[PDB]
């Protein structure tokens, strides 16, 4: 049995998404583009952080 | 490190010490320290307490 | 929801309280009795 | 004074890890833990009663 | 982690474990591990050992 993370807070803008993360222990975050070029990215998060995509 | 020992029949103790490196692997995309109440299930393997041939 | 000022009041002895945290209830697991939930953590602690 | 405890009784509850990696019903269980003091003391609530016969 | 336990009246033990994160805060402009003999005094808060209503 493995645990699950809590929900983030999300705000919207023109052609971008902003997210605020609340981790309790190290967690992995990744995202990809749909279509022909995925452009894979990956990072580890250990504390409160804000990202924009 | 790893150490084992026991007590003799004349109230004397014995020990022996060997070097070792212990680090359990990670299952899933999160690192956790104990067993939660709310979560998901994934496959893994164990030892069975049986004395059969 | 997660910065300075999630909870506010006018004086330490007042009874009126304003709150803007997130609170969502979740489905209980099979065979147990409990009340799980999801909530944003406190913002006053982070500022310190 | 202890007069407030005259008519009360203890109870049993669910615990997520009973020592072997499995859940069980235990006569001792945990409630909220508070860590508000700045010098680093803790206050813990359990299901049994101490000091009363 | 945090663990509690006690001994039954038939010589049987019981335990229960919950996850936790413990890190006392920092007071002043230096980090120290014990209480010194020669130093300075600063404010803080604590719990009082009183059973009053």
Coordinates of C-alpha atoms in Angstrom, one line a residue:
Chain A
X1 CA 0.0 0.0 0.0
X2 CA 1.2 3.5 -1.1
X3 CA 0.0 7.0 -0.2
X4 CA -1.5 9.8 -2.3
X5 CA -0.8 13.5 -2.5
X6 CA -3.1 16.5 -1.7
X7 CA -4.6 18.8 -4.3
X8 CA -3.0 21.9 -5.7
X9 CA -4.3 25.5 -6.2
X10 CA -4.7 26.4 -9.9
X11 CA -5.2 29.8 -11.6
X12 CA -5.7 30.5 -15.3
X13 CA -4.3 33.0 -17.7
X14 CA -3.8 33.5 -21.5
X15 CA -2.0 30.5 -22.8
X16 CA -0.6 29.6 -19.4
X17 CA -1.4 27.7 -16.2
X18 CA 0.0 28.6 -12.7
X19 CA 0.1 26.0 -10.0
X20 CA 1.1 26.1 -6.3
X21 CA 2.3 22.9 -4.7
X22 CA 2.1 21.7 -1.1
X23 CA 4.4 18.6 -0.5
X24 CA 4.8 16.6 2.6
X25 CA 7.6 14.4 1.3
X26 CA 9.6 14.2 -2.0
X27 CA 7.3 13.9 -5.0
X28 CA 7.8 13.7 -8.7
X29 CA 6.3 16.0 -11.3
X30 CA 6.3 15.5 -15.1
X31 CA 4.5 16.8 -18.1
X32 CA 4.4 16.3 -21.9
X33 CA 3.0 17.9 -25.0
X34 CA 0.4 16.2 -27.1
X35 CA 1.0 15.9 -30.8
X36 CA 4.1 14.9 -32.7
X37 CA 6.8 16.4 -30.4
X38 CA 6.4 15.4 -26.7
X39 CA 9.1 17.5 -25.1
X40 CA 9.4 15.5 -22.0
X41 CA 10.5 17.2 -18.7
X42 CA 10.9 15.9 -15.1
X43 CA 11.9 17.3 -11.7
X44 CA 11.8 16.5 -8.0
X45 CA 10.0 18.7 -5.5
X46 CA 10.9 18.8 -1.8
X47 CA 9.3 22.1 -0.5
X48 CA 6.7 24.7 -1.3
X49 CA 7.1 25.9 -4.9
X50 CA 5.3 27.8 -7.7
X51 CA 5.6 26.9 -11.4
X52 CA 4.2 28.3 -14.7
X53 CA 3.8 26.5 -18.0
Chain B
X1 CA 26.7 -2.4 10.0
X2 CA 25.1 -5.6 11.4
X3 CA 25.6 -7.3 14.8
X4 CA 24.2 -10.5 16.4
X5 CA 24.6 -11.9 19.9
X6 CA 23.3 -14.2 22.6
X7 CA 23.9 -15.1 26.3
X8 CA 25.7 -18.1 27.5
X9 CA 24.8 -20.6 30.3
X10 CA 27.3 -19.0 32.7
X11 CA 26.0 -15.4 32.3
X12 CA 28.5 -14.4 29.6
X13 CA 27.6 -12.5 26.4
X14 CA 29.1 -12.9 22.9
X15 CA 28.9 -10.8 19.8
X16 CA 30.2 -10.6 16.2
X17 CA 30.2 -7.6 13.8
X18 CA 30.3 -7.4 10.0
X19 CA 30.1 -4.5 7.5
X20 CA 27.1 -4.2 5.3
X21 CA 25.0 -1.6 3.4
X22 CA 21.2 -1.6 3.8
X23 CA 18.9 0.6 1.7
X24 CA 15.4 -0.6 0.7
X25 CA 14.2 0.2 -2.8
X26 CA 11.4 2.6 -3.7
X27 CA 8.0 1.6 -5.0
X28 CA 5.9 4.1 -6.9
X29 CA 6.6 7.8 -7.5
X30 CA 6.8 8.9 -3.9
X31 CA 9.2 8.3 -1.0
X32 CA 7.4 7.5 2.3
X33 CA 8.3 6.3 5.8
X34 CA 5.3 4.4 7.1
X35 CA 2.0 2.8 6.2
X36 CA -1.0 5.1 5.5
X37 CA -4.8 4.6 5.9
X38 CA -5.9 6.1 2.5
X39 CA -4.0 5.1 -0.6
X40 CA -3.5 2.6 -3.5
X41 CA -2.1 -0.9 -4.0
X42 CA 0.8 -2.0 -6.2
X43 CA 2.6 -5.3 -6.6
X44 CA 5.7 -6.4 -4.6
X45 CA 7.2 -9.6 -3.1
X46 CA 7.8 -11.0 0.4
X47 CA 9.1 -14.1 2.3
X48 CA 6.6 -16.7 3.4
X49 CA 6.7 -18.2 7.0
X50 CA 6.5 -21.9 6.0
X51 CA 8.8 -24.8 7.0
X52 CA 7.7 -27.2 4.3
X53 CA 10.2 -28.9 2.0
Chain C
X1 CA -5.9 29.7 0.5
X2 CA -2.2 29.4 1.3
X3 CA -0.6 32.8 2.1
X4 CA -0.6 35.3 4.9
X5 CA -4.2 36.2 5.9
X6 CA -6.2 33.0 5.3
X7 CA -8.0 33.6 8.7
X8 CA -9.0 37.0 9.9
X9 CA -10.6 38.6 13.0
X10 CA -11.1 42.1 14.4
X11 CA -9.8 41.6 17.9
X12 CA -8.6 38.6 20.0
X13 CA -11.9 38.5 21.9
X14 CA -14.3 38.6 19.0
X15 CA -16.6 35.8 18.0
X16 CA -16.8 36.6 14.2
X17 CA -14.3 34.6 12.1
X18 CA -13.6 34.7 8.4
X19 CA -11.9 31.7 6.7
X20 CA -11.0 30.9 3.1
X21 CA -9.3 27.5 3.2
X22 CA -10.2 24.6 0.9
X23 CA -12.1 21.6 2.4
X24 CA -13.1 18.6 0.2
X25 CA -14.4 15.3 1.6
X26 CA -13.2 11.9 0.2
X27 CA -14.6 8.4 -0.2
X28 CA -13.9 6.0 2.8
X29 CA -11.8 2.9 2.2
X30 CA -13.3 -0.6 2.2
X31 CA -13.9 -2.2 5.6
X32 CA -13.0 0.8 7.8
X33 CA -14.9 3.6 9.6
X34 CA -13.2 7.0 9.3
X35 CA -13.7 10.5 7.8
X36 CA -10.9 11.4 5.4
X37 CA -10.5 14.9 3.9
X38 CA -8.2 17.2 2.0
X39 CA -7.3 20.7 3.1
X40 CA -4.6 23.3 2.4
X41 CA -2.0 23.8 5.2
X42 CA -1.8 26.8 7.5
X43 CA -0.3 30.0 6.1
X44 CA 0.7 31.6 9.4
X45 CA 3.2 28.8 10.1
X46 CA 4.9 29.2 6.7
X47 CA 5.4 33.0 7.3
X48 CA 7.4 32.3 10.5
Chain D
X1 CA -9.8 17.0 40.6
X2 CA -10.6 13.6 39.1
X3 CA -14.3 13.7 39.9
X4 CA -15.1 14.4 36.2
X5 CA -14.2 10.8 35.3
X6 CA -16.7 9.0 37.5
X7 CA -19.1 7.7 34.8
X8 CA -16.7 7.3 31.8
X9 CA -15.2 4.2 30.2
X10 CA -12.4 3.4 27.6
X11 CA -12.9 2.0 24.1
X12 CA -11.2 0.2 21.2
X13 CA -10.2 1.7 17.8
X14 CA -8.4 1.1 14.5
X15 CA -4.7 1.4 14.1
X16 CA -2.8 1.4 10.8
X17 CA 0.3 -0.5 11.8
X18 CA 0.5 -2.9 14.7
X19 CA 4.2 -3.7 14.6
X20 CA 4.4 -6.4 11.8
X21 CA 3.2 -4.3 8.9
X22 CA -0.5 -5.2 9.2
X23 CA -3.5 -3.4 10.7
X24 CA -5.4 -4.5 13.8
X25 CA -7.8 -3.4 16.5
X26 CA -5.9 -2.2 19.5
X27 CA -6.7 -1.1 23.1
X28 CA -4.3 1.9 22.5
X29 CA -4.7 4.3 19.6
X30 CA -3.7 7.8 18.6
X31 CA -5.6 11.1 18.3
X32 CA -4.3 14.5 17.2
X33 CA -0.8 15.6 18.1
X34 CA -0.2 19.3 19.0
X35 CA 3.1 21.1 18.7
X36 CA 2.2 24.7 19.3
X37 CA 4.9 25.5 21.9
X38 CA 8.1 27.2 20.8
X39 CA 10.4 25.2 23.1
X40 CA 9.5 21.9 21.5
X41 CA 7.1 20.1 23.8
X42 CA 4.3 17.8 22.7
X43 CA 0.8 16.9 23.9
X44 CA -0.6 13.5 22.9
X45 CA -4.1 12.0 23.3
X46 CA -4.7 8.3 23.6
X47 CA -7.8 6.0 24.2
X48 CA -6.9 4.7 27.7
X49 CA -7.1 6.4 31.1
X50 CA -4.2 6.8 33.4
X51 CA -4.4 7.3 37.2
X52 CA -7.9 5.9 37.9
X53 CA -8.8 2.4 39.0
Chain E
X1 CA 7.6 8.5 13.3
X2 CA 5.9 8.2 16.7
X3 CA 5.2 5.0 18.7
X4 CA 3.4 4.3 22.0
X5 CA 2.8 1.1 23.9
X6 CA 2.2 -0.7 27.2
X7 CA 2.1 -4.1 28.9
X8 CA -1.1 -6.1 29.5
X9 CA -2.0 -8.0 32.6
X10 CA -1.2 -11.4 30.9
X11 CA 2.3 -10.3 29.9
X12 CA 1.4 -9.3 26.3
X13 CA 2.7 -6.1 24.6
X14 CA 0.9 -3.7 22.3
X15 CA 2.1 -1.0 20.0
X16 CA 0.8 1.5 17.4
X17 CA 2.7 3.7 14.9
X18 CA 1.8 6.9 13.1
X19 CA 3.9 9.2 10.8
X20 CA 4.9 12.6 11.9
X21 CA 7.5 15.4 11.1
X22 CA 9.4 16.8 14.1
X23 CA 11.7 19.8 13.8
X24 CA 11.9 22.3 16.7
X25 CA 12.1 26.0 15.7
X26 CA 15.2 28.2 15.9
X27 CA 15.5 31.0 18.5
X28 CA 18.1 33.7 18.0
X29 CA 20.9 34.0 15.4
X30 CA 22.7 30.7 16.3
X31 CA 21.9 27.0 16.2
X32 CA 22.8 25.0 19.2
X33 CA 22.3 21.5 20.6
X34 CA 22.2 21.9 24.4
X35 CA 21.8 24.4 27.2
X36 CA 24.9 26.4 27.9
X37 CA 26.4 27.7 31.2
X38 CA 27.3 31.3 30.1
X39 CA 24.9 33.2 27.9
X40 CA 22.0 35.5 27.3
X41 CA 18.2 35.3 27.9
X42 CA 15.4 35.5 25.4
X43 CA 11.6 35.1 25.4
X44 CA 9.7 31.8 24.6
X45 CA 6.5 29.9 25.5
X46 CA 5.9 26.5 27.1
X47 CA 3.3 24.2 28.8
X48 CA 2.5 24.4 32.5
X49 CA 2.1 21.3 34.6
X50 CA -1.2 22.2 36.2
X51 CA -4.4 20.2 36.6
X52 CA -6.7 23.2 37.3
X53 CA -9.9 23.8 35.4

